């Protein structure tokens, strides 16, 4: 996964 996409929708 990631990791570089914070939050709800990235």
């Amino acid at each position: 996964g990631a990791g570089n996409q914070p939050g709800a929708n990235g």
């Epitope: 996964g1 990631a2 990791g3 570089n4 939050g7």
Partner: antibody, heavy 119, light 114 residues
Amino acid sequence: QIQLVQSGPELKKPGETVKISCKASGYTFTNYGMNWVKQAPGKGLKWMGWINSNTGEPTYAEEFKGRFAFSLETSASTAYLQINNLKNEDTATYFCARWANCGCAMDYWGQGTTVTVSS
Amino acid sequence: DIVMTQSPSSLTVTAGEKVSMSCKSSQSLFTSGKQKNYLTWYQQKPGQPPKLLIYWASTRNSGLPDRFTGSGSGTDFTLTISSVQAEDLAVYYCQNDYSYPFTFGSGTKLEIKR
């Protein structure tokens, strides 16, 4: 065995410029974005922003837009925070912190860098 | 944006007791699709960086003792300590992680009566 090591404390005059390094080791660097957090002396925590380790794209909180720059050096697994035109309000400790693999929390933290702005 | 109001600012308890700290939002922190909460609890002992305690509002981090339980959802959250030991003197911070900007709370400072 994952460590974030930040550069040492610095004294800078008002108007001068500072760069803080954050060398990470122990994980694949370009898979975890890097956050910065401000703590004024004796005061609480404020989230400054984060930078994408993969793409390079920074994202700043509204208070830190304009005088603050996030950058990366991927070949050295090191994130950088730069503060321009230093003011008195910038005396604080600055933490670098890593996004967890969830994307829901900040997992590993550096030990902080204290900047003192004084003539 | 999400303002995180924490309560009370400082609270004092006797060693061994159980206590409650509150974290309240402006807007809800619920995904509506993943049915998971994007709230995180952090602990800052004096002179240290913050330490990750609880992510997803109740899931504990690796290596944590079983005396910290927070289980809220929506806009009302609480962090509770089962037996306060002397090593738990610290400031506790909640963080919104649902959307930018990923705001912190003001902090609850927990002190011991002996």
